[PDB]
Amino acid sequence: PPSIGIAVILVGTSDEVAIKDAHHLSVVPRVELVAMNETDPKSIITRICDLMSDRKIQGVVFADDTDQEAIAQILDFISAQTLTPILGIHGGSSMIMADKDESSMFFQFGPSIEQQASVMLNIMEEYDWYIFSIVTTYFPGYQDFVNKIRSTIENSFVGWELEEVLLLDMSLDDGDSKIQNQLKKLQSPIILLYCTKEEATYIFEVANSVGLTGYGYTWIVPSLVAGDTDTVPSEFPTGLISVSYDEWDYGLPARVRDGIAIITTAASDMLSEHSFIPEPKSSCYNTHEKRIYQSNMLNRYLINVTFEGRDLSFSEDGYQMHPKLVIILLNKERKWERVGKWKDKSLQMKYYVWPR
Amino acid sequence: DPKIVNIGAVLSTKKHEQIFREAVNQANKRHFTRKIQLQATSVTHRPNAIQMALSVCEDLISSQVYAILVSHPPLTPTPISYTAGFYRIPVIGLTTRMSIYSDKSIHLSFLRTVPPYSHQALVWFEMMRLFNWNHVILIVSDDHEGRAAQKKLETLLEGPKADKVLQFEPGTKNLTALLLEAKELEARVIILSASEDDATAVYKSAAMLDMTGAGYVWLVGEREISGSALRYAPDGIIGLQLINGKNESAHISDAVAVVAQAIHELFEMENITDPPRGCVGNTNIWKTGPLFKRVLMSSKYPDGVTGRIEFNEDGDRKFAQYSIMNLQNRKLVQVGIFNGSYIIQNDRKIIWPGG
């Protein structure tokens, strides 16, 4: 059995111990844990380009401890230029990324924008909250988000009522109070908000100054806004609901475990059906030259992988197929309390009457 | 001693670097520079996009550039929009016309001194008003750029209406299917949006079906009558050329002009922080960036070499000027210009197809 190099870049304080603690296929994984200090573009591109020359890495498992969705993007880039598979299993690396390259081989753990927004509607149904408005920025996915909502509302014999839908511009500043004006026009109990963590801190800070954080106002937001739960910006309204990847039930070493699983299994499958597995790029400083000699024939497999009795399959747009979701509620002590679980397409809530 | 602000640029050749360097020098000359003074910081394109991104970081962002100008090479401006977009440093497109960059959702801090291809619709439109074509067929490639132009024209149509829009899979060679579907309709004005290689494909099929004859009007863009696309283009076709749209030098001079004015307008305000020096370790957007985009994005430079500089909501050039072209006896012949707002028909008569 031959050995494929699988690099595991764990960013920020992490226990290499349990990580290294946690596979009889047709090929064996030669794993190598690497830590990384920084997460700007030059750091991440460089760390990975270097590692790829030192060894022959056929895969990458990326985990970080931040709320930087731009890490997901930096990775997708890196992934597509070098044609190396990359798994963003935890962190910024794992945030919703909409419209990844065609040539990419970048997959993320966690639910797609389309799915979260579905989850957000099942909730609103449980509690017969049928009247609501949407607010998004221009963040990628915003269109998938609004459109997923709409085709649900449109195709439903339930009494939905989408009251308004605001698109806010954060490309420009707000020394003119343009946003404020828009927000002041909302008049609904529920408000689905799609944007980013740092975007939302600012939006709420403004939404407060128009009395929209109070009671009578409930805000639901997706995973990338909740971000990392041990960090709650002071301007997040208490009472805020949000979906979230169950970092509780399903923690890091378990993720790095399936990390190495998918890349190994998928490699096996391709040495089997084809008697070969694509050679890892020797260097990024040479991508124009060596391009006709590379492809994404491994995606066929990186997607459809069964392991330890679980379908760890991915979708087309590169997000996990059926992940376990927790629904969390920002409480009075400003800590995030679990209040529901999402399993198949079934949602189970803790409360029958919603908390204050 | 004044504060030195750096502008950076990623340009085609060392001759153009020198032009940029000199454009800034003249801005420094033209302006009051007791408090702030510009410095020019440039590189040329890199072989692939990773090496490019990095070059941005090491060469430009390492010098705290407030802006980055970007042309083409002799490999797109995307790795540059991203790296720089990561911090909200404004990137100014000197020559790219693709419609991707008009999308604030992925190219947020991007503006250009040239309009995207899809904006040719504004001209095709004044053109339908002029020659009273009220019924048109629109044929576009089903790529981003294709849809961009379809989206753009339908906006202006809601006068003259669009009878059918026929979208086709890019890279296809036998369009006889699509074309015959268009032949059946009463309308005989046809508007095409497609690359060179897909222009060619349409143009042929269009001929073997006798639709490039007389009684047909073919209205197109610049891509559809450039290089390879001309080798099989039917006579009587009308098409456009973005005047100066490929003079890197003309556009360097004008971009630097606008940018130097914005930089000065900006420092009239307060709480202006410098961009982050270097990439390594910095992961916060430049705080002043979104303001500086706002200041650029609503700049106005009126006596500019490329004409009248002014940007729409998406950061795209407005009042761009087009040559109106007629393929006559297999020569591209100028029959007029679109001057930003008006069509101006010159002495050379238009020979339609058939004629």
Ligand SMILES: *[C@@H]1O[C@H](CO)[C@@H](O[C@@H]2O[C@H](CO)[C@@H](O[C@@H]3O[C@H](CO[C@H]4O[C@H](CO)[C@@H](O)[C@H](O)[C@@H]4O)[C@@H](O)[C@H](O[C@H]4O[C@H](CO)[C@@H](O)[C@H](O)[C@@H]4O)[C@@H]3O)[C@H](O)[C@H]2NC(C)=O)[C@H](O)[C@H]1NC(C)=O
């Ligand atoms: C692209 O092409 C367009 C069209 O030619 C140019 O636009 C016109 O530009 C001219 C010259 O600047 C403008 O002219 C002045 O018009 C005034 C009155 O305007 C009205 O009536 C016309 C006709 O219907 C309308 O188009 C227009 O909307 C107004 O309702 C006059 O009072 C002016 O006169 C005074 O100044 C002139 C010199 O400019 C002197 O000769 C006179 O003695 C007097 O002191 C003058 O004639 C015209 O208004 C513009 N029309 C429109 C609709 O835009 C653009 O300049 C050109 N663009 C570029 C980028 O080159």
Ligand SMILES: C[C@@H](CN1CCC(Cc2ccccc2)CC1)[C@@H](O)c1ccc(O)cc1
């Ligand atoms: C999505 C971002 C753009 N984004 C930031 C990260 C950057 C990642 C990257 C950098 C260098 C090399 C490769 C990849 C690429 C560009 C921006 O348009 C935006 C921000 C906020 C918003 O409401 C809408 C849009």
Ligand SMILES: *[C@@H]1O[C@H](CO)[C@@H](O)[C@H](O)[C@H]1NC(C)=O
């Ligand atoms: C990265 O930073 C940590 C904490 O300061 C340090 O332990 C480590 O040595 C650094 N890495 C390098 C480049 O040595």
Ligand SMILES: *[C@H]1O[C@H](CO)[C@@H](O)[C@H](O)[C@H]1NC(C)=O
């Ligand atoms: C992937 O492999 C599984 C299990 O071997 C099999 O059911 C199927 O053929 C593949 N799945 C897809 C997406 O076709």
Ligand SMILES: *[C@H]1O[C@H](CO)[C@@H](O)[C@H](O)[C@H]1NC(C)=O
């Ligand atoms: C365009 O470049 C500059 C514009 O300032 C000018 O000196 C030159 O003559 C022009 N050249 C062309 C290609 O027309």
Ligand code: NA
């Ligand atoms: Na833009």
